[PDB]
Design an enzyme around this catalytic site. Structure first.
Site, short mmCIF file in Angstrom:
data_model
loop_
_atom_site.label_atom_id
_atom_site.label_comp_id
_atom_site.label_asym_id
_atom_site.label_seq_id
_atom_site.Cartn_x
_atom_site.Cartn_y
_atom_site.Cartn_z
N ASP A 1 -7.21 2.52 0.66
CA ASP A 1 -5.83 2.39 1.13
C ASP A 1 -5.08 3.70 0.97
O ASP A 1 -4.14 3.97 1.72
CB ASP A 1 -5.10 1.29 0.36
CG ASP A 1 -5.66 -0.09 0.62
OD1 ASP A 1 -6.10 -0.36 1.75
OD2 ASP A 1 -5.66 -0.92 -0.32
N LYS B 1 -10.01 -10.01 -7.54
CA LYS B 1 -9.79 -9.02 -6.48
C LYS B 1 -10.04 -7.61 -7.00
O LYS B 1 -10.73 -6.81 -6.36
CB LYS B 1 -8.37 -9.14 -5.93
CG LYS B 1 -8.03 -8.12 -4.82
CD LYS B 1 -9.12 -8.07 -3.73
CE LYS B 1 -8.69 -7.17 -2.57
NZ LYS B 1 -9.81 -6.92 -1.62
N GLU C 1 0.82 -1.21 0.00
CA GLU C 1 0.00 0.00 0.00
C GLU C 1 0.85 1.26 0.00
O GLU C 1 0.63 2.18 -0.80
CB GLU C 1 -0.91 0.04 1.23
CG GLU C 1 -1.96 -1.03 1.35
CD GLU C 1 -2.59 -1.03 2.75
OE1 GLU C 1 -2.27 -0.12 3.58
OE2 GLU C 1 -3.37 -1.95 3.03
N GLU D 1 -7.02 1.40 -4.18
CA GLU D 1 -7.18 0.07 -3.59
C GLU D 1 -6.04 -0.80 -4.10
O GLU D 1 -5.94 -1.06 -5.31
CB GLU D 1 -8.54 -0.55 -3.94
CG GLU D 1 -9.75 0.27 -3.46
CD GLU D 1 -9.95 0.23 -1.95
OE1 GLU D 1 -10.84 0.94 -1.46
OE2 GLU D 1 -9.22 -0.50 -1.26
#
Lengths: 197, 206, 193, 200
Positions: free
Chosen positions: C86, C114, C48, C101
């Site tokens: 994130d 995902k 992230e 994300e």
């Protein structure tokens, strides 16, 4: 980088089995940069230890200061400059205090400048102990290679070679080592006298 | 017998290095109790140096460059000075000023005075040479009762001292690792903390 | 168990020495299972952080919601679905909002699933913001490996290797990690090149 | 200065984890005031979730499996849904029913209603898709003024709130650790704290 740290770890461990007093300063960490810096310090510490053995004096691994050395010879004295010698001894029979400053420098001109900087630390001390009735011998050594003593030179060579190998590989080494120290070690490697190894 | 204290001191050191990771490169975490105790004592002093440097806005000298190398970075041509490694420094080329820091802890003010004197005496003659060239050379010498803790909680600085002394006090075989003077200074430093800190249980992180 | 956890503790410190902000989510505890779970979260957090750096946006470590982000840009707005991105940024001069994300999945087919699930969270949001003349750019990243940025890959590998070694050690692990996440991490390790 | 608050808050968390050991996996005890304060705030929310799950007889989702993973366990084949991590779930295979729970605390009723709306809205479309596949999908959404304390005395929950705010109020270094919005919500809960339940 994987083979280099694994071998360096084993090199360090082999040196400690020969000179176990070096355990006080050693490291076998997994961090390649921290391991390289500890190998470099170990190289210097080996030189100090062997200079101290050759001179019959105490290796000052507890880093007591000059004031504390003198305290063990003359309790009352003025406060001197802060100095931590590499080695010392107090000969009470002969009323003599010896201190050692030991280093390695690849080129003779740097050895002379290192010797000067080390001697300059001690200005005035011999005069004071001259008056207060004691002999004070400052020994200053700066040699091309670390004295290996009981440690095979192969192992000191690998301390140098593997640490520089680790440190040359990347940018971020500059957080760990000054340009001056890196350059001095690299010069000791590039001009290494292989006749002995 | 030393295992509980040693395991706890490892956790203290790990937590401190998490809080201030600039200290990671100057520290170490090992299983040997005496080696760990000496690393904790060195870390206590290094935390003090770091926070004095931060408070003064200067560089913490973790690469251990010498005074001669500092001056090389300001004035390429100069005579060889005595060998000194300051705790911190900065070169302000705008103001033609060099600052050097000597930081220490000593519990008793009379020991603080002697420490300050010994540290400043290392620098004899240097300022004169630099002022001769039009530069300022400011030697800052600090000796304080307790280490400056900065972002590190004071309880953790305390635990470095208490747990290392507990380890070193179990057997006088630790005398090969620490001098009489340093051991006594740390014992004196311990008595300057409050009774509640000295006697309360500490459990570290969980 | 102590060789793995001792090593894992020093891996975590090394990572913190490079990215000190990761201290917000780090752990150095003695409990091997708790330490391993913390290292698994640190692995995802490193990815992230580095995605946020590459995009020039704020890593959302204070976990502000989408509704909070929009409150900072447009004080009056209908309540949106709860989302914690994130990363995010609000460019008020250019009336632009970015959200990130970021994830890792070992299989490309699982990356696509995902990505789809992360994108689907935001249904309807871009339309509302565009209706007010704002841009709302949803950036969704699902890659094979964490982006390591300034952190040596050695350390990211060790987070995964040592955590799984601890967790594969006993079915004690079942209390700490779901079968789904354990299987996915084991896939990342067994296919790690 | 922050030392008395930190010392006490560490012991409060320790006492809570003695009472509810399952919280140990989810929480942390550290000596840094700021990181400890955030741990206390997170623990306050986790206690509420744990007790909502217990009170409703559902699984507290401490391993943070997603809605897709929950549905994977019940239904072999299904479309990829939005990513959601419910606070709790239950799969009643015999009755072909899935339950999910979203639990939160907000000081003001108007904010409770907005939070309830934002949590429900996450699940748009899911109930209908599951109906097409033969399954009932029940979404439970709770937003209450105080965290449900269960086995944990409310005095400890009050100390989590009071001591974390005392630490974070001290200085602007807190802005590294907490958003203004979350700080304000917690401060509101403290300033309007209803003490009549602490008396009883």
């Amino acid at each position: 980088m994987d083979p280099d740290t694994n071998l360096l770890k084993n090199v360090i461990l082999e040196i400690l089995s020969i000179e176990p007093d070096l355990y006080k300063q050693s490291s076998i960490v997994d961090d390649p940069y921290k391991l390289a810096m500890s190998a470099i310090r170990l190289r210097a510490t080996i030189h100090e230890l062997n200079c101290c053995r050759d001179l019959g004096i105490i290796h000052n691994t507890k880093e007591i200061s000059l004031n504390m050395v003198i305290d063990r010879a003359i309790p009352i004295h003025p406060t001197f400059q802060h100095i931590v010698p590499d080695g010392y001894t107090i000969d009470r029979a002969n009323m003599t205090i010896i201190v050692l400053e030991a280093s390695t420098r690849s080129m003779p001109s740097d050895q002379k400048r290192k010797i000067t900087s080390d001697k300059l630390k001690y200005s005035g001390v011999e005069d004071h102990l001259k008056h207060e009735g004691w002999l004070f011998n400052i020994i200053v050594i700066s040699e091309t290679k670390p004295r290996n003593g009981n440690v095979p030179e192969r192992l000191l060579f690998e301390l140098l070679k593997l640490s520089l190998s680790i440190l040359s590989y990347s940018d971020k080494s500059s957080q760990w080592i000054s340009e001056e120290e890196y350059d001095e070690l690299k010069r000791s490697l590039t001009t290494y006298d292989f006749k002995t190894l």
